[PDB]
Amino acid sequence: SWEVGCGAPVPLVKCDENSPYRTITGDCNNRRSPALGAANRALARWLPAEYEDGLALPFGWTQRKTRNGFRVPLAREVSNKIVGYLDEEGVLDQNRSLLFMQWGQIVDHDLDFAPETELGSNEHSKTQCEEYCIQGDNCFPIMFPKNDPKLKTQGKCMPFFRAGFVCPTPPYQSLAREQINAVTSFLDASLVYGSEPSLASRLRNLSSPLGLMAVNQEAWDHGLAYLPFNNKKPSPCEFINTTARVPCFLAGDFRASEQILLATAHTLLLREHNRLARELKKLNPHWNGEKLYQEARKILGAFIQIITFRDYLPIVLGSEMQKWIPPYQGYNNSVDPRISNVFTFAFRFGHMEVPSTVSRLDENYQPWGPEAELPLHTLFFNTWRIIKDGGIDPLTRGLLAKKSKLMNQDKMVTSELRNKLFQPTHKIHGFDLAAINLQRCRDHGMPGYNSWRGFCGLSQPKTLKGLQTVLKNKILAKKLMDLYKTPDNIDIWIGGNAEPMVERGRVGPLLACLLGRQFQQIRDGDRFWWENPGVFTEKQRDSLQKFSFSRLICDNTHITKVPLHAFQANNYPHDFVDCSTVDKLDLSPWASREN
Ligand SMILES: *[C@@H]1O[C@H](CO)[C@@H](O[C@@H]2O[C@H](CO)[C@@H](O[C@@H]3O[C@H](CO)[C@@H](O[C@H]4O[C@H](CO)[C@@H](O)[C@H](O)[C@@H]4O)[C@H](O)[C@@H]3O)[C@H](O)[C@H]2NC(C)=O)[C@H](O)[C@H]1NC(C)=O
Ligand code: HEM
Ligand SMILES: *[C@@H]1O[C@H](CO)[C@@H](O[C@@H]2O[C@H](CO)[C@@H](O[C@H]3O[C@H](CO)[C@@H](O)[C@H](O)[C@@H]3O)[C@H](O)[C@H]2NC(C)=O)[C@H](O)[C@H]1NC(C)=O
Ligand SMILES: *[C@@H]1O[C@H](CO)[C@@H](O[C@@H]2O[C@H](CO)[C@@H](O)[C@H](O)[C@H]2NC(C)=O)[C@H](O)[C@H]1NC(C)=O
Ligand SMILES: *[C@@H]1O[C@H](CO)[C@@H](O[C@@H]2O[C@H](CO)[C@@H](O)[C@H](O)[C@H]2NC(C)=O)[C@H](O)[C@H]1NC(C)=O
Ligand SMILES: [Ca+2]
Numbered sequence: 001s002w003e004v005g006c007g008a009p010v011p012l013v014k015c016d017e018n019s020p021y022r023t024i025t026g027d028c029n030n031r032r033s034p035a036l037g038a039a040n041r042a043l044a045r046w047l048p049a050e051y052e053d054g055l056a057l058p059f060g061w062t063q064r065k066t067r068n069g070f071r072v073p074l075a076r077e078v079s080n081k082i083v084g085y086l087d088e089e090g091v092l093d094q095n096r097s098l099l100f101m102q103w104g105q106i107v108d109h110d111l112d113f114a115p116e117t118e119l120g121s122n123e124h125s126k127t128q129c130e131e132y133c134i135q136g137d138n139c140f141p142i143m144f145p146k147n148d149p150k151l152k153t154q155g156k157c158m159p160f161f162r163a164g165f166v167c168p169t170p171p172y173q174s175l176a177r178e179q180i181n182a183v184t185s186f187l188d189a190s191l192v193y194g195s196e197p198s199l200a201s202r203l204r205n206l207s208s209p210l211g212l213m214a215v216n217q218e219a220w221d222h223g224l225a226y227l228p229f230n231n232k233k234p235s236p237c238e239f240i241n242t243t244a245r246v247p248c249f250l251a252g253d254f255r256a257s258e259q260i261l262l263a264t265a266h267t268l269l270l271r272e273h274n275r276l277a278r279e280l281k282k283l284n285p286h287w288n289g290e291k292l293y294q295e296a297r298k299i300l301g302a303f304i305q306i307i308t309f310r311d312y313l314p315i316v317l318g319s320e321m322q323k324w325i326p327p328y329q330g331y332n333n334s335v336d337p338r339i340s341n342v343f344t345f346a347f348r349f350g351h352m353e354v355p356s357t358v359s360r361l362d363e364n365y366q367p368w369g370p371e372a373e374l375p376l377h378t379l380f381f382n383t384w385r386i387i388k389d390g391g392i393d394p395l396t397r398g399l400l401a402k403k404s405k406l407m408n409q410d411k412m413v414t415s416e417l418r419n420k421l422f423q424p425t426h427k428i429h430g431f432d433l434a435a436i437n438l439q440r441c442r443d444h445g446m447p448g449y450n451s452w453r454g455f456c457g458l459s460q461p462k463t464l465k466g467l468q469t470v471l472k473n474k475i476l477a478k479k480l481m482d483l484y485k486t487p488d489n490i491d492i493w494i495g496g497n498a499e500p501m502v503e504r505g506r507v508g509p510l511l512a513c514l515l516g517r518q519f520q521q522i523r524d525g526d527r528f529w530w531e532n533p534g535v536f537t538e539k540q541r542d543s544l545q546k547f548s549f550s551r552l553i554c555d556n557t558h559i560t561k562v563p564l565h566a567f568q569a570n571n572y573p574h575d576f577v578d579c580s581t582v583d584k585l586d587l588s589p590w591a592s593r594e595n
Contacts, residue, residue: 324516
């Protein structure tokens with residue numbers, strides 16, 4: 001074993017050991033071991049990393065070197081033969097609204113982020129990789145197979161950069177390579193407030209003692225706030241429409257403007273913070289800016305935890321929920337709350353839940369205009385559609401009235417993401433999210449499918465025949481064997497998502513195991529979990545049990561008709577009720593007395 005303490009985190013840390021508020025970086029959550037779960041630390045390894053040279057080189061790097069006796073198939077080839085399909089008809093989830101997909105992405109970004117390697121401000125490497133597809137140091141190209149149409153119109157590869165790692169970012173020689181998690185492992189709304197003090201600061205409105213988050217000053221949504229714009233140029237959001245020139249938004253998380261619906265969700269939460277903060281000042285006129293800020297923040301963090309654990313996991317894990325996440329019996333300081341490396345791939349099941357279009361609906365939940373339904377790809381890093389095309393209400397109604405895409409063995413990832421993904425850095429709508437995911441497994445030195453099956457105590461198929469029975473699909477099992485020549489080599493992302501779904505769930509057995517464990521840990525390992533005696537009062541907890549995503553929409557948008565259970569498929573107007581019928585968050589329990 002090697003150094004039990006390498007480390008390039010945010011430096012200076014000193015715990016308050018009486019502070020009723022989480023730190024921004026996640027530090028100090030655990031008392032005996034302060035850095036546990038903090039941002040900018042290595043992702044946890046539940047199993048040893050598997051690299052071509054046992055230390056840092058991904059499998060597929062050295063063409064001649066095999067994995068278990070075989071060549072690992074190209075990411076894009078696996079993408080073309082297994083993940084793609086043409087017919088979007090009949091692909092929608094009959095019982096999960098679009099919000100189901102969307103909330104998952106939110107929880108996801110609150111938990112883990114592995115940014116790519118940074119060594120380019122001045123880089124021509126950013127081009128020796130783009131232009132020539134030359135494999136070298138952190139350039140690990142996604143080569144196009146023979147007969148791939150992109151060869152004819154895009155080039156020879158997709159550029160792709162290895163993820164950052166701990167102890168430098170830079171060159172050489174030590175222990176196995178461990179990727180970084182740039183955000184806090186705890187479900188704490190870090191995505192709204194940021195994971196660095198530096199950013200948490202810039203996001204706040206410190207011009208007034210109200211504890212509000214800064215809002216846009218250039219535009220308004222019917223008197224409702226927008227997230228401030230990011231001042232930094234070049235902006236990708238500006239790029240997709242040189243004429244509208246609208247920048248990306250500035251939020252606690254850098255991926256916020258990835259897609260219009262994710263930016264919509266971010267806006268709702270920022271709105272709830274300021275809403276909470278002003279409602280609190282009304283009750284406690286005495287409280288200062290900091291107190292207003294921390295108490296609202298604390299409330300919002302409880303909201304995310306509650307919606308996630310009460311309404312969202314149950315319908316992901318289905319019958320497996322109880323098997324992995326038992327009833328809460330209290331905080332446990334012996335539990336490692338860190339997000340593991342494999343979790344960040346397991347949680348990518350959501351990619352197969354994204355449909356090809358996004359709609360905007362009007363007050364009666366009718367098409368908003370002539371071009372109400374747009375292709376997903378035209379909305380990547382698209383903020384001008386919100387700002388100069390209706391605000392977020394038409395988008396939010398879409399989230400409630402439309403359905404998520406159903407994971408389907410014959411139709412996995414929509415072409416909008418498989419062939420038209422737009423990356424921050426480059427200029428085309430031609431990347432492949434599926435291939436990227438696959439290349440990224442290898443980059444992260446992930447163990448194979450069967451290593452994880454064994455880890456979860458599940459059978460491990462060694463034969464085509466064995467794979468057919470687990471996957472319950474003859475044809476899918478076959479193309480898989482043809483490309484991988486052995487189950488042991490199947491990349492975890494595609495292997496875990498190819499399994500049939502569990503009863504009342506949306507993921508298979510393997511994924512339910514990987515997801516379930518992770519979630520039980522960040523709950524049980526969180527000293528600030530909302531139900532942990534002492535964090536909130538019994539009276540406060542009674543009030544928080546009433547949160548609902550519907551109420552959230554009611555208090556921060558001009559939608560007045562909403563469903564009671566926002567994550568299940570809901571038809572308008574039968575399943576929609578007036579906001580008055582929806583429980584409000586009673587904040588009197590936060591009222592404070594001096595004398
Ligand atoms: C907070 O979470 C902690 C981390 O999970 C929990 O710690 C675990 O503690 C148990 C022991 O109490 C550890 O193993 C389990 O308990 C028994 C070991 O004493 C085992 O009993 C069996 O041991 C083997 C069989 O496996 C036999 O030889 C023996 O005769 C008996 O059958 C259990 O089967 C079980 O493994 C375990 O190492 C800890 N978990 C890990 C890996 O960290 C702790 O329970 C929690 N604290 C509390 C009590 O709330
Ligand atoms: C565009 C993208 C999305 C929506 C249109 C989208 C959606 C999701 C869902 C719904 C997720 C979970 C339910 C989910 C998880 C994670 N993603 Fe994904 N995602 C879009 C695009 C991307 C891109 C681009 C990446 C980067 C991939 C890379 O390897 O470089 C991406 C990643 C992830 C990810 C890992 C994050 C991390 O830990 O670094 C998820 C947990 N998504 N997305
Ligand atoms: C770049 O974003 C532009 C918005 O800044 C967008 O231009 C706008 O789009 C349409 C025309 O395509 C117009 O919106 C509609 O409503 C107006 C006025 O009510 C009508 O006059 C039109 O008929 C139209 O249907 C906007 O007026 C127009 N704005 C401007 C100033 O041109 C572009 O379409 C975006 N371009 C791309 C490539 O995405
Ligand atoms: C749509 O999914 C919802 C949400 O899971 C299903 O509703 C659950 O129904 C079961 C019946 O036992 C109950 O355990 C829960 O009360 C329900 N949850 C909620 C909040 O309603 C519903 O069955 C699904 N619709 C269909 C027709 O499958
Ligand atoms: C900081 O918060 C203050 C509110 O305290 C904002 O200033 C207000 O701005 C709104 C909109 O321009 C006006 O109705 C008020 O007159 C202002 N109120 C006061 C008391 O000045 C300000 O915009 C916030 N700053 C940022 C960047 O979001
Ligand atoms: Ca977090």
